[PDB]
Design an enzyme around this catalytic site. Sequence first.
Site, PDB file in Angstrom:
ATOM      1  N   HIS A   1      31.005  40.406  58.617  1.00  0.00           N
ATOM      2  CA  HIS A   1      29.139  40.259  58.517  1.00  0.00           C
ATOM      3  C   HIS A   1      28.245  38.864  59.742  1.00  0.00           C
ATOM      4  O   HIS A   1      27.041  38.930  59.599  1.00  0.00           O
ATOM      5  CB  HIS A   1      28.792  39.239  57.297  1.00  0.00           C
TER       6      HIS A   1
HETATM    7  C1  LIG Z   1      37.801  49.444  46.916  1.00  0.00           C
HETATM    8  O1  LIG Z   1      38.004  47.772  47.264  1.00  0.00           O
HETATM    9  C2  LIG Z   1      36.954  46.761  48.460  1.00  0.00           C
HETATM   10  O2  LIG Z   1      36.570  48.672  49.528  1.00  0.00           O
HETATM   11  C3  LIG Z   1      37.552  46.661  48.765  1.00  0.00           C
HETATM   12  N1  LIG Z   1      37.812  45.694  50.380  1.00  0.00           N
HETATM   13  C4  LIG Z   1      36.512  45.588  51.003  1.00  0.00           C
HETATM   14  O3  LIG Z   1      35.317  45.076  50.814  1.00  0.00           O
HETATM   15  C5  LIG Z   1      37.203  45.020  52.224  1.00  0.00           C
HETATM   16  C6  LIG Z   1      36.483  44.630  53.562  1.00  0.00           C
HETATM   17  C7  LIG Z   1      36.588  42.826  53.049  1.00  0.00           C
HETATM   18  C8  LIG Z   1      35.106  42.981  53.719  1.00  0.00           C
HETATM   19  C9  LIG Z   1      33.588  42.724  53.140  1.00  0.00           C
HETATM   20  N2  LIG Z   1      33.390  43.614  52.484  1.00  0.00           N
HETATM   21  C10 LIG Z   1      31.823  42.897  51.991  1.00  0.00           C
HETATM   22  O4  LIG Z   1      30.997  42.267  51.964  1.00  0.00           O
HETATM   23  C11 LIG Z   1      31.222  43.319  50.386  1.00  0.00           C
HETATM   24  C12 LIG Z   1      30.159  43.361  49.047  1.00  0.00           C
HETATM   25  C13 LIG Z   1      29.971  43.965  48.499  1.00  0.00           C
HETATM   26  C14 LIG Z   1      31.300  44.653  47.754  1.00  0.00           C
HETATM   27  C15 LIG Z   1      30.589  45.831  46.379  1.00  0.00           C
HETATM   28  C16 LIG Z   1      30.782  44.857  45.393  1.00  0.00           C
HETATM   29  C17 LIG Z   1      31.117  43.904  44.714  1.00  0.00           C
HETATM   30  C18 LIG Z   1      30.604  43.140  44.295  1.00  0.00           C
HETATM   31  C19 LIG Z   1      32.050  43.799  42.962  1.00  0.00           C
HETATM   32  I1  LIG Z   1      32.856  42.575  41.611  1.00  0.00           I
HETATM   33  C20 LIG Z   1      32.858  44.531  43.725  1.00  0.00           C
HETATM   34  C21 LIG Z   1      32.055  45.240  45.055  1.00  0.00           C
HETATM   35  C22 LIG Z   1      31.799  45.049  48.404  1.00  0.00           C
HETATM   36  C23 LIG Z   1      32.242  44.288  49.444  1.00  0.00           C
HETATM   37  S1  FES Z   2      30.532  37.326  58.491  1.00  0.00           S
HETATM   38 FE1  FES Z   2      30.829  37.133  56.264  1.00  0.00          FE
HETATM   39  S2  FES Z   2      32.978  36.007  55.749  1.00  0.00           S
HETATM   40 FE2  FES Z   2      32.445  35.520  57.627  1.00  0.00          FE
END
Ligand SMILES: COC(=O)CNC(=O)CCC/C=C\NC(=O)c1ccc(Cc2ccc(I)cc2)cc1
Ligand code: FES
Lengths: 241, 48, 100, 49, 79, 49, 379, 67, 59
Positions: free
Chosen positions: F14
Amino acid sequence: GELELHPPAFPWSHGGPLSALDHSSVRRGFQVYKQVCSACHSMDYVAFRNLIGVTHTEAEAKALAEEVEVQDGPDENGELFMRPGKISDYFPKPYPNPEAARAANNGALPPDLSYIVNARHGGEDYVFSLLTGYCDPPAGVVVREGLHYNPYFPGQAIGMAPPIYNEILEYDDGTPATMSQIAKDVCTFLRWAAEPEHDQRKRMGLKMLLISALLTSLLYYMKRHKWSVLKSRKMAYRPPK
Amino acid sequence: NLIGVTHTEAEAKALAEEVEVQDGPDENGELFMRPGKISDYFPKPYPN
Amino acid sequence: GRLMDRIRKWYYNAAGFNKYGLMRDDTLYEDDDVKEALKRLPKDLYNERMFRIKRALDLSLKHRILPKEQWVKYEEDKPYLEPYLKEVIRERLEREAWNK
Amino acid sequence: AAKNVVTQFISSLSASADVLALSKIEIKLSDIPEGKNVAFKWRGKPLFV
Amino acid sequence: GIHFGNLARVRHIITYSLSPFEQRAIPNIFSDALPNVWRRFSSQVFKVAPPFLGAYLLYSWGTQEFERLKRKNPADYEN
Amino acid sequence: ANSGDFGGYYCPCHGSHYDASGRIRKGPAPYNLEVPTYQFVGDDLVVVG
Amino acid sequence: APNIRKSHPLLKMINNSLIDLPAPSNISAWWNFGSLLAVCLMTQILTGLLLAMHYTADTSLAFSSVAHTCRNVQYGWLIRNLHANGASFFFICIFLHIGRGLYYGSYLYKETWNTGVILLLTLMATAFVGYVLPWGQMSFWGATVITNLFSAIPYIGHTLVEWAWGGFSVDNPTLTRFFALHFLLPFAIAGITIIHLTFLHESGSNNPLGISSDSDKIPFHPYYSFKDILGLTLMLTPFLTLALFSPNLLGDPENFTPANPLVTPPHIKPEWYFLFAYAILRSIPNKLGGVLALAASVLILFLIPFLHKSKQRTMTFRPLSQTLFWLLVANLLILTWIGSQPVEHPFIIIGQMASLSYFTILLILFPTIGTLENKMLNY
Amino acid sequence: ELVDPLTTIREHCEQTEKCVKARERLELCDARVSSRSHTEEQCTEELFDFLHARDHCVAHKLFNKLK
Amino acid sequence: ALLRQAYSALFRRTSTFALTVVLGAVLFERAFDQGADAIFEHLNEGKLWKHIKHKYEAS
Ligand SMILES: COC(=O)CNC(=O)CCC/C=C\NC(=O)c1ccc(Cc2ccc(I)cc2)cc1
Ligand code: FES
Ligand code: HEC
Ligand code: HEM
Ligand code: HEM
Ligand SMILES: CCCCCCCCO[C@@H]1O[C@H](CO)[C@@H](O)[C@H](O)[C@H]1O
Ligand SMILES: CCCCCCCCO[C@@H]1O[C@H](CO)[C@@H](O)[C@H](O)[C@H]1O
């Protein structure tokens, strides 16, 4: 290096949504893996039996797999003993664990190449250019000792020594072992290695598209047919007067 | 597991240090022996 | 002024519920007040509203509209309910403020 | 009764007992030339030196 | 669970329709079908497309402006 | 490490920028990188626990 | 007595909710997604079990089991494909199914709607956990970032997370309990889906014109049963076309690398269906803000029913609202894209804007245009 | 001693205008930079621009000659 | 007339309608498979193991 050079789009013989892998370029690619990459790169999810019916004959594979000594056991005294390889074994690791490999490649870890084709943005297109694209650092760029330049690799400082050069090996089918001719075959292999289904996957796809075309239309009829009644329908408001 | 039941924290540390366990690999990829920590399980008298 | 009046006419042709033959008040969402109002409608005015809708519905199902010559025209649009409604609402407003 | 059975079940989720002791580290400041960073598998999460 | 019969009070409406077997699968594909498929497209493309196009632009700009900021400006090296 | 606008760190998840002190300087991040309680021993050695 | 289709305490149901069910003679194709979503669910569950019958929830074997399943199980590979993408096709469908509702104000059927929301929330959660099972690099880092989200709540914050991971950082206990979660949740969806539909059946379906339809209804069968079998095959084609001709289009490849709790990848993006959220969380530069904005970015759906001001039910007859609606849609498309991009100019500012505009179109422009509109009809 | 169709076409392409145009820009960058120390500039960009145009070209033909 | 003969001996009796889809599908499969296999093995001539097979199959 906020900047990066992306690879081009070679017309692989199997790129098309109906194009099977080149089962010959694959047999070769393999040889290239077996005789060059398999000295630093592991292939843990592939095994000699996989080759059968795809690039080699049953007899060949047996022999192929017997060219290696594997670690089975314990025996009856409880000692681990070496034994010849069977079609059921997977491709041998060049190292006993990542800790080792690193140490024998300058702290760099030559990643297992089973799913490599699908793990790097660009796939076989990228893997090809990395192999071929090795060159000299442009003006103002100093590559740390032990690292070679490669514009295609992110950071441009790749810990892998340029693995191929004309005639580095010699295909048994009588094919010009030019640098690219190899890099083409090995990249083609990686694909098969990465998703063996590939062929049967596209064959079904076709079949699917055909049924799906026919069946969708056949139903566009039966939906309308029934609905006609409501579409043709006419109504009128006839009060008392 | 002994702690709080039959032995004191101190005792167990020592108890567990009376054995050499097989940890690793290291930096070169070699398995090396090292003294025992409270987190190890009782040692097998045989390898299999 | 004669702006809101030349505006309203536009919007009216804009919403386009006339294309279906529906009067302004045919498209009203039926909350509790409307419901009540509709029940107070004179036998006929109701049977008429009915047809118009069952006809519009028949259209929306066929995906077609009315030929240009049958569309409602901004000035010939009869607000057959607006009065009955304002009464229902007026009535209700009372009961409510009286319960204090 | 209820309060205790919920407590019971709920801590079933929290950390286990096989959650290690911690503290251990061997490091040669010499292997790290000036200006560089390195990752060490420390107590679960990375450790920068 | 029965809803058919208790719905609404309707008076004086006559409806006529024909068996499916008596009428056509899909009729007037040209004298009626298409010419209406169009009308619709026409009337709606002016409420829909606008903001979509609006996005497209913004996408390209943002993207083009970003790839632009990656290149190097000589005025920092002519010294 | 070896990325960002503060010659220290950067978290691609982020976009939080950390300096060479591991202190948070820019981004959504809110607190500075935790620091382990450690100590030096010899010329080119060091250990934590 | 008379017929055995209205007196059988079981058969009566399939007939009381799937055959004699009165339906507006005019519902469009945006009403089809309902079923599809259902067929979608039941279908995921099948591929799901089939899969679960070969997976092995345990860090040291999670990744490898999925590969073995693909490589060694008969048609395994295919079976994964269908599951992996079904999820998308699922989210797609659900998305329209929600837009359909917004446009035609189905949201006036409060209960039928609210459940819907809960359903969405569960699907969202469900996919989250499923995605972590293959224990890939994203799986991990995803599992690590998402759960960490709760650490935004003060006091019970850091502490709540612990249960989640079942440790002091993501490890086995997390994986295994996620597998449990994933195995269970779907069924809960199927359950709530029953309440969802059951609430809907008190009022009948809404319809494109936004006015009474009693004046003319038709038996779900064969009018909509047929309309739906067709709808299913029209959507099924592309979804199969992807899962058969371009399996990895929608999927990040970084997740083909076994999780490494030591290296978070440089180019980190969640799967498409979470981008808009992602974008918003990334729009506000504050742990809590981002979370909150996120939380509301979806939780806002609960409000849509109280933000209806138009005297009419559907937008069909409100061009102004319509344009504002499509502006919102597109607005969303952008937010997604933005999520696909790194935190840098212009993106940061673009993101920030789009969010503001999202929340604003819903909280202020819709209720405001809605009123204005009425006065222009003279009400 | 045989010739890798690659190096043969890598030649041919370096003649296309696009190539030379960028090839030159580099030649120049390379110069000003190599002949100056206490800099910052790098000729990566220029290089890529080159390799980019070059190889892209290589891509259209190369495979015709490979087996 | 085929359609009439069709409607009379097939699509009429619900019992034989079914009996047709069955014996029918049967043929369809058998046939379809062949086609697609052929349309495919043809679009990929000399690239399938079924084509390379004889260069090592000592016979
Ligand atoms: C299908 O699974 C994915 O896409 C999960 N994998 C990833 O997000 C891979 C990357 C990881 C890094 C950051 N992800 C986020 O900041 C992120 C933030 C919000 C969400 C939506 C969500 C919220 C709660 C809830 I509970 C669910 C969703 C989903 C992801
Ligand atoms: S910028 Fe979000 S985990 Fe580091
Ligand atoms: C001399 C050992 C060695 C041999 C033999 C070798 N490689 Fe490598 N390879 C490496 C090393 C080291 C890396 C890791 C580079 C790094 O991460 O710094 C690597 C990495 C790779 C990568 C890309 C890693 C990335 O992050 O993009 C690919 C692809 C690859 N090798 C392919 C091959 C192919 C194909 C062959 C056989 C034709 C081959 N290698 C032979 C040592 C070797
Ligand atoms: C697994 C989740 C869901 C499934 C399988 C599902 C299924 C259905 C079905 C079968 C219908 C009836 C047919 C139709 O109108 O499409 C329906 C209606 C409805 N659903 Fe859902 N739904 C789901 C999620 C949601 C969500 C997330 C929302 C929005 C918050 C929602 C809101 C509604 C509403 C408003 C209706 C009324 C339809 C109308 O306007 O006539 N649903 N749903
Ligand atoms: C609620 C509908 C479902 C959704 C939305 C869904 C979604 C997913 C997702 C996102 C993944 C990761 C896919 C990938 O690796 O690319 C997955 C994996 C998995 N799911 Fe589901 N799933 C659903 C239901 C289920 C059910 C009902 C089961 C069985 C109880 C199940 C079993 C599995 C298994 C075994 C995996 C791990 C293997 C794999 O990744 O392929 N899923 N699911
Ligand atoms: C007599 C019964 C023999 C059953 C053998 C099962 C072997 C399955 O053989 C299958 O044949 C297909 C041909 O179209 C190939 O496309 C598949 O990849 C292959 O697995
Ligand atoms: C109907 C029967 C209800 C059974 C209630 C018994 C509650 C169990 O009580 C338990 O006793 C243990 C021993 O001291 C404590 O360590 C636990 O924290 C406590 O929850």
